[PDB]
UniProtKB/Swiss-Prot annotation:
Mg(2+) binds at residues 8, 10, 12. DNA-dependent RNA polymerase catalyzes the transcription of DNA into RNA using the four ribonucleoside triphosphates as substrates. Belongs to the RNA polymerase beta' chain family. The RNAP catalytic core consists of 2 alpha, 1 beta, 1 beta' and 1 omega subunit. When a sigma factor is associated with the core the holoenzyme is formed, which can initiate transcription. It comes from Escherichia coli O157:H7. The chain holds residues 453 to 503 of 1407 of the full protein. This is DNA-directed RNA polymerase subunit beta'.
Length: 51
RNA sequence: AGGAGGACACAAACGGCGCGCG
C-alpha cells in the first residue's frame, strides 16, 4: 500500500478517521477498502506494483 | 333513719514572528 500513499517510512506522520454511522462503514468497505483500489484511476496501471 | 330537698446543570483560543519535520 505504501506506493499509493507515496509513503516513505522515514518518520512520516499519518492520520486516522473513524467512520461512525452504518452507511459510513458500508461506504468505506465498498469504495475505500484497500482491495477495491488495485487499479489506478489515471491509467490502466496497477497501484500495487511490487515494492 | 322515714320523707323531702340537695440548589440542578458546568472542563483550557486567536493573531503574528521564528524554527523544524514531512
Amino acid at each position: 500500500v505504501c506506493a499509493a500513499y507515496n509513503a516513505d517510512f522515514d518518520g512520516d506522520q499519518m492520520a486516522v478517521h473513524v467512520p461512525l454511522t452504518l452507511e459510513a462503514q458500508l461506504e468505506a468497505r465498498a469504495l475505500m477498502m484497500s482491495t477495491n483500489n488495485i487499479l489506478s484511476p489515471a491509467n490502466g496501471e496497477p497501484i500495487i506494483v511490487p515494492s
